[PDB]
Design a protein around this motif. Structure first.
Motif, PDB file in Angstrom:
ATOM      1  N   UNK A 119      -4.943-125.353 -72.331  1.00  0.00           N
ATOM      2  CA  UNK A 119      -4.561-125.466 -73.608  1.00  0.00           C
ATOM      3  C   UNK A 119      -4.480-126.872 -74.048  1.00  0.00           C
ATOM      4  N   UNK A 120      -4.860-128.017 -73.180  1.00  0.00           N
ATOM      5  CA  UNK A 120      -4.691-129.209 -73.295  1.00  0.00           C
ATOM      6  C   UNK A 120      -5.786-129.993 -74.552  1.00  0.00           C
ATOM      7  N   UNK A 121      -5.702-129.494 -75.554  1.00  0.00           N
ATOM      8  CA  UNK A 121      -6.996-129.631 -76.535  1.00  0.00           C
ATOM      9  C   UNK A 121      -7.298-130.950 -76.774  1.00  0.00           C
ATOM     10  N   UNK A 122      -6.216-131.752 -77.016  1.00  0.00           N
ATOM     11  CA  UNK A 122      -6.495-133.146 -77.005  1.00  0.00           C
ATOM     12  C   UNK A 122      -7.214-133.965 -76.013  1.00  0.00           C
ATOM     13  N   UNK A 123      -6.740-133.671 -74.761  1.00  0.00           N
ATOM     14  CA  UNK A 123      -7.426-134.022 -73.623  1.00  0.00           C
ATOM     15  C   UNK A 123      -8.849-133.597 -73.411  1.00  0.00           C
ATOM     16  N   UNK A 124      -9.227-132.257 -73.709  1.00  0.00           N
ATOM     17  CA  UNK A 124     -10.394-131.625 -73.809  1.00  0.00           C
ATOM     18  C   UNK A 124     -11.290-132.457 -74.800  1.00  0.00           C
ATOM     19  N   UNK A 125     -10.990-132.418 -76.031  1.00  0.00           N
ATOM     20  CA  UNK A 125     -11.510-133.460 -76.978  1.00  0.00           C
ATOM     21  C   UNK A 125     -12.075-134.851 -76.441  1.00  0.00           C
ATOM     22  N   UNK A 126     -11.032-135.712 -75.918  1.00  0.00           N
ATOM     23  CA  UNK A 126     -11.227-136.964 -75.332  1.00  0.00           C
ATOM     24  C   UNK A 126     -12.397-136.939 -74.253  1.00  0.00           C
ATOM     25  N   UNK A 127     -12.483-135.999 -73.307  1.00  0.00           N
ATOM     26  CA  UNK A 127     -13.492-136.035 -72.364  1.00  0.00           C
ATOM     27  C   UNK A 127     -14.686-135.380 -72.651  1.00  0.00           C
ATOM     28  N   UNK A 128     -14.721-134.572 -73.701  1.00  0.00           N
ATOM     29  CA  UNK A 128     -15.991-133.805 -74.020  1.00  0.00           C
ATOM     30  C   UNK A 128     -16.857-134.289 -75.182  1.00  0.00           C
ATOM     31  N   UNK A 129     -15.997-134.904 -76.284  1.00  0.00           N
ATOM     32  CA  UNK A 129     -16.602-135.552 -77.318  1.00  0.00           C
ATOM     33  C   UNK A 129     -17.739-136.760 -76.976  1.00  0.00           C
ATOM     34  N   UNK A 130     -17.383-137.459 -76.072  1.00  0.00           N
ATOM     35  CA  UNK A 130     -18.452-138.555 -75.776  1.00  0.00           C
ATOM     36  C   UNK A 130     -19.828-137.989 -75.279  1.00  0.00           C
TER      37      UNK A 130
END
Ligand SMILES: [Ca+2]
Ligand SMILES: [Ca+2]
Ligand SMILES: [Ca+2]
Ligand SMILES: [Ca+2]
Ligand SMILES: [Cl-]
Ligand SMILES: [Cl-]
Ligand SMILES: [Cl-]
Ligand SMILES: [Cl-]
Ligand SMILES: [Cl-]
Ligand SMILES: [Cl-]
Ligand SMILES: [Cl-]
Length: 462
Positions: free
Chosen positions: A190-201
């Motif tokens: 549930x570390x949503x910020x880091x999921x976004x960081x690594x997945x969005x790119x």
């Protein structure tokens, strides 16, 4: 002896994937591993042939189950191999270029991180072995927590992503594979910020990932390594027993080991597509009595007697349209797509929904809907609305790909989803409830391990 040159290290690396491919002993992407992974949700009922799978499906398994035991030990076999390579590389680093050292470390840490993820995903808390002895060590070792195991896995995958190439040969990891695996650990934590960081790119240049126009290309032979593929395993490419014959009907020479539940069919059928037809994903995933349904190149109602027209059959990962039967041995092999771009899109949907970017989240869900020729998301612009369709799209998108149980589990939806699915499975599952947990939510540390490793305490509830 081995370890002599770059070629030897490259061969060692290839051998680290072998425990994922193991067919009969719980290799994660082998036939029995797949069965364990799909058995515990609401997707399928297994018949009582392969007893160790049936007990898992029915929530009557014990800590002596030989198949869950085998799964456990395959993970540790792979860890031993990856740790051994790291040690040998360090020992011999002086004979290798720094570029070669980096390539080996990047791949080896991807592999170690992936297995560590699965180990703690399946067993929660377990011994954490990060060194390899001359022989795999049977020395006593207390368990590490899920959090600690996943911490190691994140460290490995972070370093891997930084060292891996943007493209790679089929079956070899890319930086995108490492980022996507890492993103999944963030999602599970549930570390949503880091999921976004690594997945969005991964949705942007310089990556080239895209959803394929034909969903079925994810599950065939001829479109292996397609533009949606992130990481694939060549199961036949390995210090005879394959998936499709298992699930095919007796009518076409198979062993009819499992069938889709009514509950899962209801999910597939709920929403029709823009043209009023059944979701193409459902039509690629299961055969049932609808107009024009084909099964092994014959009409459904011709293959099955009238008394069987109300039955349901798995199509995903089957030779149901290339062949008229499932011969043994198999004529070809359909790579297991371990990570594909749909996973990145739906993980982003989930992370953005949880962080509160609902429009963004809906955008990601709509990419998935649009590929499936559905209308766009029409639920309320609320966290609860968007979550309802996240769950729904994941159920349909990743049917029998080993996500549904773990998803229901991490979402706290498992108990209620089993409740509506089958009274007897639910009854059995509820016997596992004790304190604030359910013993059936994770496979137990095997009795064999508790006997051989006296510092290891049993799984909670077991
Ligand atoms: Ca046994
Ligand atoms: Ca790179
Ligand atoms: Ca193939
Ligand atoms: Ca029901
Ligand atoms: Cl039962
Ligand atoms: Cl058992
Ligand atoms: Cl290739
Ligand atoms: Cl290729
Ligand atoms: Cl966050
Ligand atoms: Cl059925
Ligand atoms: Cl639950």
């Amino acid at each position: 002896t081995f370890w002599k040159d770059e070629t030897d290290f490259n061969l060692a690396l290839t051998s680290c994937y072998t425990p994922l491919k193991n067919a009969l002993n719980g290799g994660y992407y082998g036939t029995r591993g797949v069965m364990l992974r799909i058995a515990r949700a609401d997707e399928v009922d297994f018949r009582n042939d392969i007893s160790d799978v049936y007990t898992v499906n029915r929530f009557t398994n014990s800590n002596t189950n030989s198949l869950t035991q085998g799964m456990f030990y395959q993970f540790y076999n792979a860890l031993y191999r990856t740790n051994s390579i790291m040690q040998k590389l360090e020992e011999k680093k002086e004979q290798f270029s720094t570029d070669f050292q980096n390539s080996v470390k990047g791949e080896c840490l991807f592999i170690r991180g992936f297995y560590l993820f699965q180990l703690a995903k399946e067993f929660k808390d377990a011994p954490l072995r990060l060194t390899a002895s001359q022989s795999p060590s049977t020395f006593p070792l207390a368990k590490s927590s899920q959090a600690d195991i996943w911490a190691q896995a994140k460290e490995d995958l972070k370093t891997a992503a930084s060292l891996l190439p943007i493209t790679n040969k089929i079956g070899k990891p890319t930086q995108g594979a490492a980022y996507a695996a890492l993103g999944k650990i963030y999602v599970y934590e549930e570390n949503w910020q880091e999921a976004i960081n690594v997945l969005e790119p991964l949705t942007q240049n310089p990556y080239t990932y895209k959803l394929v126009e034909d969903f079925n290309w994810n599950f065939d032979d001829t479109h292996e390594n397609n533009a949606e593929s992130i990481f694939e395993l060549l199961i036949e490419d390995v210090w005879s027993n394959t998936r499709p014959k298992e699930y095919a009907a007796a009518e076409v020479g198979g062993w009819y080991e499992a069938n889709p539940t009514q509950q899962i069919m209801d999910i597939f059928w709920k929403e029709k597509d823009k043209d009023g037809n059944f979701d193409y994903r459902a039509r690629c995933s299961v055969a049932w009595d609808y107009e024009g349904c084909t099964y092994y190149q014959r009409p459904f109602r011709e293959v099955f007697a009238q008394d069987k027209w109300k039955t349901y059959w798995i199509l995903k990962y089957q030779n149901w349209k290339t062949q008229k039967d499932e011969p043994a041995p198999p004529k070809s092999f359909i790579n297991e797509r371990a990570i594909r771009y749909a996973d990145v899109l739906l993980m982003l949907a989930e992370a953005y929904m949880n962080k509160g970017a609902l429009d963004t989240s809906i955008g990601y869900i709509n990419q998935i809907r649009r590929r499936a020729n559905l209308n766009d998301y029409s639920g309320p612009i609320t966290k609860e609305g968007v979550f309802e369709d996240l769950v729904h799209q994941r159920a349909i998108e990743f049917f029998v790909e080993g996500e549904r149980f773990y998803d229901l589990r991490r979402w706290g939806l498992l108990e209620q989803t089993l409740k509506t699915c089958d009274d007897t499975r639910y009854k059995n599952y509820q016997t596992g409830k004790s304190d604030n947990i359910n013993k059936f939510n994770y496979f137990p540390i095997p009795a064999k391990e508790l006997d051989t490793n006296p510092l290891c305490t049993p799984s909670e509830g077991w």
